[PDB]
Amino acid sequence: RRRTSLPAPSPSSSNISLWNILRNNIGKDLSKVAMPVELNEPLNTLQRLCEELEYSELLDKAAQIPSPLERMVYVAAFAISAYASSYYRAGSKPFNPVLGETYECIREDKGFQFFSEQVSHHPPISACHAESRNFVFWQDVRWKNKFWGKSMEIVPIGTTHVTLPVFGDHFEWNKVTSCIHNILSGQRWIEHYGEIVIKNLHDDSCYCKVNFIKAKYWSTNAHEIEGTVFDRSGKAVHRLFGKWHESIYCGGGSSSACVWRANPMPKGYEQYYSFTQFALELNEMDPSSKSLLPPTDTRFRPDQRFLEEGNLEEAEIQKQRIEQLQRERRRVLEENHVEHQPRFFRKSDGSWVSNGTYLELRKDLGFSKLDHPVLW
Ligand SMILES: CCCCCCCC(=O)OC[C@H](COP(=O)(O)O[C@H]1[C@H](O)[C@@H](O)[C@H](OP(=O)(O)O)[C@@H](O)[C@H]1O)OC(=O)CCCCCCC
């Protein structure tokens, strides 16, 4: 049904430019350092946000569990699951979405409706919302990435929210710190360290803490997680252990059970940017839905598509042209002293949340009646 391959394979490696680019900007803000298209992968930060739903069935399961603590356990696993994918794409760069660029994924498969918009470019900020009968997932993310002499630090900012449709739950949790070791080189690998605190704003009963342990590459502790579900009193009720890229278990003492396991990677995934089966389907465009998409949707972005098709020269041409276009548009917008307003997200306190207009206007080819910004 869905594609399980790409028109052209990913290149051996073309990270020669990365050496000088990163050594010349130690300590500087990388979102301001333009980089060749050859370093990118066919997905952008909006689609990367969509991948956090690969294991969305965890929420489907928590949607019918009446105990709040078990619901907490499964949602914690879901929060950790958002990291599995990064293990194989150890060092990989997503496309930087254009201001106003949008991305959608209608999956009748997992019963969810996902959409997102790049609400800001200076600094880059991605916002997303996914709706389902069994949950509502939404978040706002921005970065503070920097390259120090031999390693890259990815610092995400913005919390993630999930709501369940029959219990009234509102889960809110923070992103953790990531490090890419040996980017310039050796064995390039990604590490995730820090503490995730998951709170249920609606249910006082419990809270959860998941620690992502940092260690030496060859250690039996690398990729480990130590989590606990605490009652209001502050007493440990359920332990969580395992490795964020293989399996997650609950229990710890008397008993134990595996609550989550990474999906097997496609046979020969190494030849396709080490994408997961899920990631392979995000940029595919299906003849019927093409008419329902808005022209700002990423599958339309020409440089990214040429990249999938293995056309490096024409991909680079399109990228620089899109950059010049974006600059001239922010130019015209600021010569009139008018701030930019995104189309599907309004700014509540500091976050970017859905303004309830995407799906509604998508109804019955409704996008065809209006007209959108031309980003390419
Ligand atoms: C990895 C986690 C994802 C975090 C990334 C999220 C933020 C992000 O896309 O910033 C991009 C940087 C490199 O910009 P790049 O792709 O050339 O995007 C261009 C630049 O932002 C450029 O300054 C801008 O010009 P303008 O300002 O004139 O408008 C253009 O509009 C953009 O096209 O890349 C990086 O952040 C470096 C990450 C390298 C990944 C690891 C490699 C192995």
Numbering used by the authors: 511 to 860, 862 to 887
Excerpt from the publication:
Human ORP3 belongs to the oxysterol-binding protein (OSBP) family of lipid transfer proteins and is involved in lipid trafficking and cell signaling. ORP3 localizes to the ER-PM interfaces and is implicated in lipid transport and focal adhesion dynamics. The ORP3 ORD displays a helix grip β-barrel fold with a deep hydrophobic pocket which is conserved in the OSBP gene family. The ORP3 ORD has a central ligand-binding tunnel with a flexible lid covering the tunnel entrance.
The PI(4)P molecule was well ordered in the crystal structure with clear electron densities of the ligands. PI(4)P binds to the ORP3 ORD by inserting its two acyl chains into the hydrophobic tunnel. The phospho-inositol group of PI(4)P is recognized by the shallow basic pocket in the tunnel entrance. The conserved residues Lys829, Glu833, Arg836, and Arg837 from helix α8 make direct interaction with the phospho-inositol group. The 4-phosphate group makes hydrogen-bonds with the side-chains of the conserved His631 (β4-β5), His632 (β4- β5) and Arg837 (α8). The 1-phosphate group connecting the inositol ring and the glycerol moiety is hydrogen bonded to the conserved Lys603 (β2), Lys829 (α8) and the backbone amide atom of Met660 in the lid. The 5- and 6- hydroxyl groups of the inositol ring make direct hydrogen bonds with Gln836 (α8) and Glu833, respectively. The ORP3 ORD is unable to bind PI(4,5)P2 as the 5-phosphate group causes a steric clash with the side chains of the residues in the helix α8. The PI(4)P used in this structural study has the acyl chains of C8. Ligand modeling into the ORP3 ORD suggests that PI(4)P with various lengths of acyl chains up to C20 could be accommodated in the binding pocket.
